[PDB]
Amino acid sequence: GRVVVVVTSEQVKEEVRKKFPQVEVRVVTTEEDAKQVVKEVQKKGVQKVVVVGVSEKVVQKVKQEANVQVYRVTSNDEVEQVVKDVKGSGLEHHHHHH
16 A cells, blocks of 8 residues: 655654655645645555645645545654554544444
8 A cells, every 4th residue: 555644844754754764755835846746646656645734625625636545644643653554444533333
């Protein structure tokens, strides 16, 4: 499973790339930046994408036109966790079992 970590600040990028240099890391700040990134990874063969400090409305849009699974980061534990499993999604927040 492929995954890409996206950050809003360069600081987070250095920390991410340092934690997992073997993995794909791309820092985006503007709409044009992310665009060039999505295409870059799209050609390489991406599967997932974990953005940190990024707006959901932004990732949501691109994700739709990207045809991939988008994930948002809330804490450092979420970054290592998401990447750890790489590919593993269950169901929506709201459950249903009667």
